[PDB]
Amino acid sequence: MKHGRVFIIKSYSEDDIHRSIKYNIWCSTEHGNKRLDAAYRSMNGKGPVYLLFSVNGSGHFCGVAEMKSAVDYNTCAGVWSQDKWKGRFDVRWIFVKDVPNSQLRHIRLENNENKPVTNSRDTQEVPLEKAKQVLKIIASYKH
Ligand SMILES: Cc1[nH]nc2c(NC3CC3)ncnc12
Structure with a gap:
């Protein structure tokens, strides 16, 4: 695996x-x-x-x-808030819950100039060890 x-x-x-x-x-x-x-x-x-x-x-x-799923680049147009979003892939949402950036902002990404993970751009990849730290914080956060 x-x-x-x-x-x-x-x-x-x-x-x-x-x-x-x-x-x-x-x-x-x-x-x-x-x-x-x-x-x-x-x-x-x-x-x-x-x-x-x-x-x-x-x-x-x-x-x-x-x-x-892999990305399908030729799918129904105009289904999102704006037309510029083109193509589709399947996802499975594992859980839905709000976690404040304050809980994550001290996790820094060594592949993104050691910037906080909360300052990332779309499709910024996360190093494995930092991703584990982020996922455990998100999973266990309690309001
Ligand atoms: C369907 C979709 N995929 N990416 C989206 C987006 N990205 C902005 C850069 C933050 N904004 C709104 N809708 C989106």
């Missing part, structure tokens, strides 16, 4: 996130789709690709999903 690969997902539409949770699908930018497609295919089913979702300006992460 292989350890998971873990990516930050950012959205500036809460409605798009709602749709993602309801129907277990997502789409990124062109370069973001390529990045996730490469990772999913190179895993070759021997470990998961995890996605850590966060709405721009919300000050919190909102949950965790697993990538469940």
Whole structure:
């Protein structure tokens, strides 16, 4: 088996996130789709690709999903908040819960100039050991 690969997902539409949770699908930018497609295919089913979702300006992460398919680049147009989001891949949301950035901001990414994980861009990949730290904090956070 292989350890998971873990990516930050950012959205500036809460409605798009709602749709993602309801129907277990997502789409990124062109370069973001390529990045996730490469990772999913190179895993070759021997470990998961995890996605850590966060709405721009919300000050919190909102949950965790697993990538469940390769990217399909030719799908129905205009299904998201804006037309610029093209293509589709399946996801499985593992859990949905808000976790304040304050709980995560001291985790820094050595592959992103040691910036805090909470300052990441869409499809920023997370080093394994930091991803474990983030996932355990998110899993155990209590309001
Ligand atoms: C469906 C979708 N995929 N990426 C999205 C996004 N990314 C912005 C950079 C933060 N914003 C809104 N909807 C999106």
